[PDB]
Design a protein around this ligand. Structure first.
Ligand SMILES: COc1cc2[nH]c(C#N)cc2cc1CN1CCC(Nc2ncnc3sc(CC(F)(F)F)cc23)CC1
Length: 466
């Protein structure tokens, strides 16, 4: 190693002291990822993993943080000999990046729960020899910075992480695992995944982080959870303040999900004088549209979740329809299972529960109910249309009869006189999927033909013999 200027703020005695440290690092040529992750993991460990003895804030003494930093840098420098991998051009090689990845991987405990909380940071790597998937990729980037490899940067999709490096930062390399059971492609490019138009690789519209965005990633990666019931107020506040610092300095401009995280925090505990959560969610969506060709799903899911929690049914449906309008131009691939699970939950649990409550409130006399609004019925139909279109040309199917039951139920929540008002053109809606085009006459009928809907959604050819 640490430079003298990096040590002057220690000891860190409060949240605001940590925020100062992040401010100073972010004002530097290159913020120190190793330092910052070690601090965050330290504070998270003593605020969420083990709060014994806590009286206000776990003081971060320099002697402690410098010793952790020395354990990291020693481990990396000792195991990665740079002289074996000459840098033609001030850029790194694939072999060098692979060696760093191997080093991190080989340092990890043989067996542990890979999905635990609080194993994302370099503090976890040093003290527990444990990291989660994306934590490995972050550690590889941290290790590369510590080695002077200024070209190696973190790349992020909505459910995976890897690195970019080399001439013009144009190379990609896998450095960690994804999911559970996937035979890894460590050392390879992501170009096959890009080419198959999976959600996992975002058709190539993934985030290529600069150092400032890598700091934003570690801040999103703070995990305030103490247990299933309980969050650390101190960590929530630290994460919120750190996200505002990044925001003010411009470093969330290209980070849609960080804006959604900040909006969620503001909904929980709003900061006087700051934009509303809704404004923040829409800024996330604008970031996606500006930098990522509007090919991200979470900016709309964050918005829908907010509307859902606030029982803005119309606005939740619109936002879900918007998520489907994104997913429709992907192919559903092996390894996209996380987004399939989220779509499944929305269609088959969340929406039905919202419409069930809406129907009770309608019986009680609500006015302006989603169930009386043809534009809400349009949103519902646009949601299913994108899911159907997503499925077209995919190497695995999406829909099955489990989805059909909930579709029939959700349609039936709207009276025919409401459903009949939606104009399906070849409130006005255009269908992109052949499944929904063929369902058009069934959708606007007084009595919902349940069997015919099922047959159309699942393309089941035949009904019961006997
Ligand atoms: C499963 O989590 C969610 C499901 C949700 N459904 C709806 C609706 N309707 C809203 C909603 C919100 C969430 C919360 N989830 C949103 C995504 C967020 N993920 C992220 N947030 C910031 N940065 C990154 S980088 C990355 C890929 C990587 F982990 F590195 F491999 C993921 C990710 C973590 C929290």
């Amino acid at each position: 190693g640490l430079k003298a200027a990096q040590k002057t703020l220690f000891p860190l005695r409060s949240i605001d002291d940590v925020v100062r440290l992040f401010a100073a690092e972010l004002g530097r040529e290159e913020p120190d990822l190793v330092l910052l992750s070690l601090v965050l993991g330290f504070v998270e460990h003593f605020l969420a993993v083990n709060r014994v003895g806590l009286t206000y804030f776990p003081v971060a003494d320099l002697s402690i943080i410098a010793a952790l930093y020395a354990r990291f840098t020693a481990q990396i420098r000792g195991a990665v000999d740079l002289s074996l991998y000459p840098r033609e051009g001030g850029v790194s090689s694939r072999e060098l990046v692979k060696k760093v990845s191997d080093v991190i991987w080989n340092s990890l405990s043989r067996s542990y729960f890979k999905d635990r909380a609080h194993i994302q940071s370099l503090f976890s790597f040093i003290t527990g020899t444990k990291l989660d998937s994306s934590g490995v990729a972050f550690a590889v980037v941290g290790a590369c910075q510590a080695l002077g490899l200024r070209d190696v940067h973190l790349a992020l999709s909505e459910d995976h992480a890897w690195v970019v490096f080399g001439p013009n930062g144009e190379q990609t390399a896998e450095v960690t695992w994804h999911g559970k059971g996937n035979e890894d492609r460590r050392g390879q490019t992501v170009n096959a995944g890009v080419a198959e138009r999976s959600w996992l690789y975002l058709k190539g519209s993934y985030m290529r982080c600069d150092r400032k965005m890598e700091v934003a990633f570690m801040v999103c990666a703070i995990n305030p959870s103490i247990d299933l019931h309980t969050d650390s107020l101190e960590l929530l506040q630290l994460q919120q303040k750190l996200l505002w610092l990044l925001y003010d300095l411009g470093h969330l401009e290209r980070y849609p999900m960080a804006l959604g995280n900040l909006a969620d925090l503001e909904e929980l505990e709003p900061t006087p004088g700051r934009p509303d959560p809704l404004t923040l969610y829409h800024k996330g969506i604008a970031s996606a549209k500006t930098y990522y060709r509007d090919e991200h799903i979470y900016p709309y899911m964050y918005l829908a979740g907010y509307h859902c929690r606030n029982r803005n049914v119309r606005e939740a449906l619109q936002a879900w329809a918007d998520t489907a309008t994104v997913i429709q131009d992907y192919n559903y691939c092996r390894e996209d299972e996380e987004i399939y699970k989220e779509f499944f939950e929305v269609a088959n649990d969340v929406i039905p529960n919202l419409l069930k409550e809406a129907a009770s409130l309608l019986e009680a006399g609500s006015q302006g109910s989603a169930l009386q609004d043809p534009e809400c019925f349009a949103h519902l139909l646009r949601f299913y249309d994108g899911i159907c279109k997503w499925e077209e040309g995919s190497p695995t199917p999406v829909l099955h009869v489990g989805w059909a039951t909930f579709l029939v139920q959700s349609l039936g929540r709207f009276e025919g006189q409401v459903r009949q008002k939606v104009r399906i053109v070849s409130p006005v809606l255009t269908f992109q999927s052949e499944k929904m085009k063929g369902m058009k006459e069934l959708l606007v009928a007084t009595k919902i033909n349940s069997s015919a809907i099922k047959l159309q959604l699942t393309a089941q050819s035949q009904v019961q013999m006997k």
